Every structure is written in structure tokens, then in C-alpha cells.
């Protein structure tokens, strides 16, 4: 009596045939096991509920009991729910970097995450290096990037350059990355992107006591209040260290400071659902904040090592390959000179 489910990661598609009593947890486990992700703490299963709200699957309940939009298969998006503080320090596996890279690039390209042009071109140069490998004047002739969406729409139509003049600027940078591993360009992409003001921020529309409209931001470090007009710079910052507790009562959402003699900050949200979603994200972000500031578990040390073994194997498999190619590129230089 199996229900069919489709799970789409940022670059792969999975079908499972679950039982009707299968938990989110059990499905999640089959997913990360299928693609060899062990850094599971960052990720979740996203879906559309019966009213078209995009919703995180709850791992401790039956999949079928969570108001999933009815169709065969059920459709989930495997996505990053949480972002590390430093991609260099905390993204261990190749799979993990790639899914983060792809999810963040989508956000940059569709203008969800704001990016100045120069930085946009620079990020575009690292994506090109990952997709096309070392630039090559033979293979990469003019307009070899013509069929590629490399910049955000906002960059394209507020600057006078044409798409070829953008492509040319991205090419200069692509030449400088010659010798960069595909995977090492992914990380450089992430090292630039993780510094942007809007990277790793979940915003919700809120109103203050008075009633002035605002945004709330929740990220790995805490909560922020932004003006309606400006989601780049916080008005005030609420880092975990400076917060006693965080509470909702229906539409009312409250931040109580550490300083018992300091007054509480109070906000209202359009619905209870928004307030549940906000508190869950704070809980999840705070949980990983605290874990980040504790020695690697034994498990994590083994992932760090398993990761190191596998990259070495790949490094050698790329040298063994490159060695046989230079035998063949020569074996033609020999037969080309015997002719001439």
C-alpha cells in the first residue's frame, strides 16, 4: 500500500515508495543515505501544504499526517535550513559544499540575495571555473558563456553593459583561476557569498508596538530588526549572548534581553504560523551556535577523516588520468612529425 514520493536536491532527483506510517525522519534518513551526506544538521525536507504554504517536514511525525498537497508522487525539496558561520571551518564533505553552492547561487541569480556587480562578476567567474574547468583558448572561443545565466537580473538591467561585455569581464577572471580544482572554486564562491549582508538571513514581515511595518531577520548569530526599505543593515542587533528568552503569544512575539533591568522588545506578526516558524528557526540556529562552540564529536572527526581519504583518492585518480592523456597528446605529436 506504498505512497510514492519524489525528493529533489539542488542537482538530483530521488523516488522512494514509503509506507503510510513513515515519519519525516525515516524519509529524511533514506535521502541523506542515498546521496552520502552525513552533515545532516543543516538540511530539511520542504513541501507545499494544502493551502500552498511552503513548509518544513517535521521529522517526528507520519509524512501522511502533515497536510502535504495530494498528488503522486508527493514532492519534496531537500534544502539547507541552516547556514554555518564559516564554510571553510564547518563544510566537511564535497556533497555538502555543492548543495550549499547551488542553493546560494540560485538565490544570487533570482535576486533573493543582494549582490553588487563586481562581486557578482567575481562569483560568476568561480561558478564558470566549476562548470567549465580550466579556461582553454582552443575550446572556450568567443560567446562560450552566451547560453549561461551568470549574473542576477538586477545586475543585468541597471547597468548599460550588454551580455557579451559581461561575459568578457567574467572571462578575464576565469583565466586567472587556471589550475583551480572545480571543488576549490565552489568554496571560493561560498567564501565570498557568506560575507554578503543577506546571505543566511530568513526575513519575515512584522510591525513594532506603534505599528510601523518592519522585517525580522534570523541567522546563525541571532535576530535583527530592519526598516521596511533596507534589508542590508540592521536597525538593532539581537545576538544570542544579549537575549534571555524569546516567546510568542498568538500574533505577539517578544524578545526579552539578558539585562533584567532593560525593557523587553515586542513585535506582532500577521499570523501564529509565522511566529511558530520564527521560533523553530531561532531554536535550530541557537542549537548549532552552541554545538559549533564545543569540540567535534567522535562521529565528526571520522567524517573529517573519511572526507580527507576520499579527496586524496580523487586527487590521484585525476593525476593517473592526466598522465595517460599526456601520453596520447604526445603519441599524436610523434605521428604528426613522422608525417611532416
Amino acid at each position: 500500500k506504498t505512497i510514492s514520493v519524489r525528493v529533489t536536491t539542488m542537482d538530483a532527483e530521488l523516488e522512494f515508495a514509503i509506507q503510510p506510517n513513515t515519519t519525516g525522519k525515516q524519509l529524511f534518513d533514506q535521502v541523506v543515505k542515498t546521496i552520502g551526506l552525513r552533515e545532516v544538521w543543516f538540511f530539511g525536507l520542504q513541501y507545499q501544504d494544502t493551502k500552498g504554504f511552503s513548509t518544513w517536514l517535521k521529522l517526528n511525525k507520519k509524512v501522511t499526517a502533515q497536510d502535504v498537497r495530494k498528488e503522486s508522487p508527493l514532492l519534496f525539496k531537500f534544502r539547507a535550513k541552516f547556514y554555518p558561520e564559516d564554510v571553510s571551518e564547518e563544510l566537511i564533505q564535497d556533497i555538502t559544499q555543492r548543495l550549499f553552492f547551488l542553493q546560494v547561487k540560485e538565490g544570487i541569480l533570482n535576486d533573493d540575495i543582494y549582490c553588487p556587480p563586481e562581486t557578482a562578476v567575481l562569483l560568476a567567474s568561480y561558478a564558470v571555473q566549476s562548470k567549465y574547468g580550466d579556461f582553454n583558448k582552443e575550446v572556450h572561443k568567443s560567446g562560450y558563456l552566451a547560453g549561461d545565466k551568470l549574473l542576477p537580473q538586477r545586475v543585468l538591467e541597471q547597468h548599460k553593459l550588454n551580455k557579451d561585455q559581461w561575459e568578457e569581464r567574467i572571462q578575464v577572471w576565469h583565466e586567472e583561476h587556471r589550475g583551480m580544482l572545480r571543488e576549490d572554486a565552489v568554496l571560493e564562491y561560498l567564501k565570498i557569498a557568506q560575507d554578503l549582508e543577506m546571505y543566511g538571513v530568513n526575513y519575515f514581515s512584522i510591525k513594532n508596538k506603534k505599528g510601523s511595518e518592519l522585517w525580522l531577520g534570523v541567522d546563525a548569530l541571532g535576530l535583527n530588526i530592519y526598516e521596511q526599505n533596507d534589508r542590508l543593515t540592521p536597525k538593532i542587533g539581537f545576538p544570542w549572548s544579549e537575549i534571555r528568552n524569546i516567546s510568542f503569544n498568538d500574533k505577539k512575539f517578544v524578545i526579552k534581553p539578558i539585562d533584567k533591568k532593560a525593557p523587553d522588545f515586542v513585535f506582532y506578526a500577521p499570523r501564529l504560523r509565522i511566529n511558530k516558524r520564527i521560533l523553530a528557526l531561532c531554536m535550530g540556529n541557537h542549537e548549532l551556535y552552541m554545538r559549533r562552540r564545543k569540540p567535534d564529536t567522535i562521529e565528526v572527526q571520522q567524517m573529517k577523516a573519511q572526507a580527507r581519504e576520499e579527496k586524496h583518492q580523487k586527487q590521484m585518480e585525476r593525476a593517473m588520468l592526466e598522465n595517460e592523456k599526456k601520453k596520447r597528446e604526445m603519441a599524436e605529436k610523434e605521428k604528426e612529425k613522422i608525417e611532416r
Binding site: 537575549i243 528568552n245 524569546i246 510568542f248 531561532c282
Partner: peptide, 8 residues
Amino acid sequence: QKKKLVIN
């Protein structure tokens, strides 16, 4: 409905 998250 109410809920409290202790941060500190």
C-alpha cells in the same frame, strides 16, 4: 497559544 525558548 504560547511558547518560550530559553537562550540564556
